[PDB]
A paper describes a structure:
Briefly, all members of the glutamate transporters family (SLC1A) consist of three protomers subdivided into a rigid scaffold domain and a dynamic transport domain. During the turnover, when a transport domain slides along the scaffold domain, a transient aqueous channel is formed, which creates thermodynamically uncoupled anion conductance.
The structure revealed that all three protomers were in the fully outward oriented state, rather than the intermediate outward state observed previously for the wild-type protein in the same conditions, indicating that the states may be very similar energetically and minor differences in the experimental procedure can favour different conformation of the transport domain. The side chains of the residues in L-Asp binding site (Ser280, Met314, Thr317, Thr355, Arg401, Thr402, Asn405) assume the same position in the wild-type and mutant proteins, confirming that there is no rearrangement that leads to a disruption of the binding site. The mutant protein still has the kink at position 208 in helix 5, despite removal of the helix breaking proline residue. Combined with Isothermal Titration Calorimetry (ITC) and 14[C]-L-Asp transport assays the data show that the binding affinity for L-aspartate remains unchanged, the transport rate of L-aspartate is reduced by 2.5-fold in the mutant compared to the wild-type, and the anionic conductance is increased by 3-fold. Perhaps the interaction with the lipid leads to longer dwell times in the anion-conductive state, and somewhat disfavour the transition to the inward state, which is then reflected in the reduced transport rate and increased anion conductance. In conclusion, we have shown that the mutation of a helix-breaking proline into arginine does not abolish the kink, invalidating previous hypotheses that such a mutant would undergo major structural rearrangements affecting the binding site and the transient anion channel.
Author numbering:
A (entry chain C), C (entry chain B): 16 to 115, 129 to 430
B (entry chain A): 16 to 114, 129 to 430
Write the structure that this text describes.
């Protein structure tokens, strides 16, 4: 566990530097090695998505793809709704807040791109997913054609994407060799920057939020995994490279390459499931963001002395799940969509309003909460993949046996 | 003809909704299914162009490509010039109007500065130039004496060949949804502009649509019979692209289905239809030229300054010249119509009522965009069969009952 | 030498037209045939880079790639530093000037792209180089795998890039058939436009700068080439297509396709060296830009009567080499980065001081100096490739024997 050692050592180094006022030295000396690690992984996000979906979709019939697609969507929505429920529980238990819209139809239509090459250039995950899935379905239909020229043309096209997919998986393994320094550098800069703001009432928010994410892993991804027969301890131990990487990169879409490599080289999941459930889940399944939004909504409301009612806590659950899909896999994306959650309950943010000062207080520790959010936003993607794969008999039983 | 049934049923539904003031309900309930249909076809425009040109150009020698290229350009210019002539005839008969980019730089823009940027920016002409020479280079490498170069070129062509067949397969799947997309698209357009066609604007719509109907049956029915191609079979076979262009209102948008129809219903070799269709989708728009001819007289007659006989000839050259300028996007004919009006001297100013007549046309621009795109792709199909017949690339079995 | 004949004939035609005031006719009649030539070559820059690096890197083991990479960087920095030294010598000898910042760490991090498809769309050479090199390294590792499916998938992926590379090399040969008209048109317009501004003190700058570039070729690329055994006369004669093309296109990145074709079809250099040293050198190795900056810094200083001291001439050398990497392979890129060189020595540019007046005077003949700059910015890339190839035994001895 050398990678995990860097996270603990870097946090101590960041706290020591932050307490001694050495944040400036770390920002211009250590961080540049953390930024290189983020850029290396963010580079492989697009090639590993276009290649994996085409090979993954072409390896299974469209009938099984529909069953797998519907199955994971129910899990994604149920876990996201459960995550918001946990957020209200931990927020009320800790009593946070003591002192002191995009079109839904247009968002669905945006799944279908107007230019597949522009979506790759613009770094859009969902439009690429739609184009690559139907490309894989079209490829596997051409391989069943009676003509020999069409069959060989489709095989050559798939081999290019198959060779591209294996190339990216190989590069990720090389990149993670540098992760022992990238993880150490990333956590050191974040700890040094925000090692002081967590002093008073903001500390209760961090404690309440992090308690919810910890409970979410061991009550939602430990009970459901045991129901379907997957060992929870093995799942957490195997998926520690993506959990640590998401805990430093703070971008679920950013830590997509390593999540794909871990899900297939450590869990034995077929390419027809993990290649589809991971990128789609990286854009629509973020339980940590939903749980964080639940706590902060109560924190903002309790700061201005207008706590949510029992009925008001139910409408905010639906919006939090709805806003969860809206958030992208980029750092600091949960605070932007948190405004829509606050406006849903009626707490509009006005330039000098009290609800616009509690919002600024959250943004002070937004990065320290972004770390916990991304840690579980990819764990749910992995946990759902094993659950769906177990029901589809695509799990490799040898990989889960000591 | 289930697809054609949706167009007629949707028009009735749109007229009923528009007359009862239910345009708001259609815009937020029905249009979203039409927008999905447009996005599905617009997605396949770029992959179906890059893959088809490479395979199409590599399947024939460059000598035949030059003969085919020159042959269709003469047809494209002759039909466009004829289309403007029809527009003046129908405009004068109906008595409508009762109540600049560098040319050299445009030609230089055909050669891209970055092939990947052209694909990302959705440019058809720069992609055409790069893909044609890529296909020519590929077919030259396959004739090399070295074995490694020959296999490398074959693998590169098979990737584009597999990509081309994949897009053609996806189009067939998309057109299964066209029974709902066409119905939704025509319903929203009819509901939105079912009231503005009431008075003098109705005469413009009648005069313009008469010209496009006459253009199909006098230009694409006489020339097709001269070269031996049956006109009735051509119209019946190319009804999927005609209907799709009549709802999408974007010739570049309805390029995928036009390619699939031209090869799975007409038996045209990939070396002709893959080249003549995208190039024609950017430079051959007879409906736009015919529409511009009628509206120029309508604008002039509205302000009481009719064009003279000499003034009607200079406006013909500009209309053909402005026809190439228009892109395959909705509402692109009105933007370039300003250049046609300024050519004859009718500059648009906020003070003069010249801009007032221009604004009146924009009110029914979408209802005229539907007829324009309907023939802008028919001419691309009609020219392809004419060129293919002269090149003996037409499949005679596909044109025999 | 028909191509070289057009350059001489076009210069005479441009001078005659410029002297008679016929620059307007040439700009709207002749230049458009030169612009077509530039667009044709600029189109092939990206496909010839992505395809060549992948095939070049996969053809050799990563151990040899590191040795070649380090070897050429030392040559690139040594020649660039030598070029600035020559600029001060010719500038002081001619006595020019008689009358009258981007982050370094961020620039290095920008080598690793965040989206490989966006880098291709945005026309970035260095980010594409990094992605294509590791893609080639990953491909050659997959071909050594024990599995048969992975081996065939990697071979198919390489054959696509191999077929793409040979296609671009074939297109360049076709484009250079038109170069007899493109070179004539390009040089005619430039000569006609700036055939009058070279009259007085600006003529001394052109003479001093062009003397330095001529001396650089015959003292730096003629002594070092003879040391390693490569004939200097054969190198210049063979690499005359790229030298002339760079002398009209005025963009080293623009004249990358022909430089690649000349380096492999006339010098017998393996694809693992020239495909890597040329595009990297087209962005970081510009000796002509460095030599031009050295002369103009003294010219600007001497114009305002504040000549550089002996110590001040050494700090300006380091910045000129540092600013040399900053310049891109586009026309007029040396004047933009020349401001940083002037500010390094203390000569900040202000509208009031005549420092900007001397800078504006240089911009008047910037294009006539851009021609000489690009002529040697690609010669150094070619000269370094043969030197590195000779040490790696990848040079074809048959191509260098009459
Ligand atoms: N940065 C988080 C989203 C958030 O800000 O909540 C992620 O990528 O998962
Ligand atoms: N939208 C039309 C052009 C026009 O507006 O006339 C087309 O794509 O063909
Ligand atoms: N245009 C030159 C750079 C410069 O302006 O000095 C080149 O591409 O090499």
């Amino acid at each position: 566990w050398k990678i995990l050692w860097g996270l603990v050592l870097g946090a101590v180094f960041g706290l020591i530097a932050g307490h001694f006022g050495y944040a400036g030295a770390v920002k211009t000396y250590i961080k540049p090695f953390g930024d290189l690690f983020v850029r290396l992984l963010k580079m492989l996000v697009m090639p590993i998505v276009l290649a994996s979906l085409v090979v993954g979709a072409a390896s299974i019939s469209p009938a099984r793809l529909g069953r797998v697609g519907v199955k994971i969507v129910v899990y994604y929505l149920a876990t996201s709704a459960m995550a918001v429920f946990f957020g209200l529980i931990v927020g009320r238990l800790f009593n946070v807040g003591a002192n002191v819209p995009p079109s839904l139809v247009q968002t669905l239509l945006n799944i279908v791109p107007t230019n597949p090459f522009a979506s790759l250039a613009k770094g859009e995950v969902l439009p690429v997913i739609f184009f690559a899935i139907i490309l894989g379905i079209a490829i596997t239909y051409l391989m069943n054609r009676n003509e020999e020229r069409v069959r060989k043309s489709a095989e050559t096209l798939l081999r290019v994407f198959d060779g591209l997919a294996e190339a990216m998986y190989l590069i990720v393994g090389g990149v993670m060799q540098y992760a022992r320094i990238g993880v150490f550098a990333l956590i050191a800069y974040v700890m040094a920057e925000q090692g002081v703001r967590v002093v008073g009432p903001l500390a209760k928010v961090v404690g309440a939020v992090y308690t919810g994410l910890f409970l979410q892993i061991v009550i939602t991804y430990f009970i459901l995994l045991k129901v379907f027969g997957i060992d929870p301890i093995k799942f957490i131990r195997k998926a520690k490279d993506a959990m640590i990487t998401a805990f430093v990169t703070r971008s679920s879409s950013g830590t997509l390459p390593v999540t794909m490599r871990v899900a297939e080289e450590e869990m034995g999941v077929d390419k027809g499931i993990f290649s589809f459930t991971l990128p789609l889940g990286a854009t629509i399944n973020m339980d940590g963001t939903a749980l964080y939004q639940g706590v902060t909504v109560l924190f903002v409301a309790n700061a201005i002395g207008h706590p949510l009612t029992l009925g008001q806590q139910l409408v905010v659950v639906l919006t939090a799940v709805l806003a969860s899909i809206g958030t992208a896999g980029v750092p600091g994306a949960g605070a932007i969509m948190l405004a829509m959650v606050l406006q849903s309950v009626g707490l509009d943010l006005t330039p000098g309003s009290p609800v616009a000062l509690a919002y600024a207080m959250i943004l002070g520790i937004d990065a320290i909460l972004d770390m916990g959010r991304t840690m579980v936003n990819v764990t749910g993607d992995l946990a759902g993949t094993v659950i769906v794969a177990k029901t589809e008999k695509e799990l490799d039983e040898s990989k889960w046996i000591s």
